[model samples]
Target: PVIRRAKEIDLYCLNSLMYKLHDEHHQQCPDEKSIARYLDDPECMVYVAEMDDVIIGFITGHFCELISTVSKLVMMATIDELYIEKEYRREGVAEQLMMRIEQELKDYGVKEIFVEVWNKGA
Candidate 1:
């Protein structure tokens, strides 16, 4: 298995994973066309876990600034999508992806990590 940053061509595979997860878990999904548009922004980044050249899991996030007591460039690594194929779950694939995401955020001077999970009583 290979884990690395994602490229433009990886959208189809990534988006399909996002689409399925949202539909099955959340009953909704962001527009596929829009994901690519937003994901390409300089502030955003996506990472993937691949096996035999096929993307099996992904983590999508981006950096944002926040200020209050002290003005600083803090990254808000909001995890937008994190899904591993069912059979891949509990096998450490998702954990590994999350660890890598955290490592990258640390490199960016990230201040916080936010994750959203939908529950449908499955």
Candidate 2:
């Protein structure tokens, strides 16, 4: 799979993948406008995995400066969304996505990264 930064042309597939991920959790799909903003925002980043010109997965996130009285400004980033099609799982596609995003965040001078995991009851 080829991994690269997502472009405006990838929005449709990105939105579709996002809907698929949310559907699995019984959650509403995100608005296209918001996803589009991710591409437009300088602080936000979105990357996609493509095979044969089709997008199969994506990772999105944003970074910001964290201010604290006890410490100097810290660059922080949060992984907002990550998903890969079922057919592409177990092939390290997800890991590639994560690695790409983390590398990009680090390039942006991000000092710390955060991820939120929902504990769906077992």
Q: Could you say which candidate leads in lDDT?
A: 2
Show the colliding residue pairs in model 2.
Answer: none
lDDT of 2 at 84: 84
Across residues 5-112, which tens digit of lDDT does each residue of candidate 1 receive? 888898788678887777777545444436687667888777889988788888877777765686655556676678888767777887778788778888887767
Per-candidate Cα lDDT values, in order, are 0.74, 0.81
Q: Provide the lowest-lDDT 10-residue window in model 2.
A: 113-122
Q: Which residue pairs overlap in candidate 1's backbone? A: none
The TM-score, computed over Cα atoms with residue i paired to residue i, of candidate 1 is: 0.79
lDDT of 1: 0.74
RMSD of each: 4.9, 4.6
Error of 2 at 74 (Å): 1.0
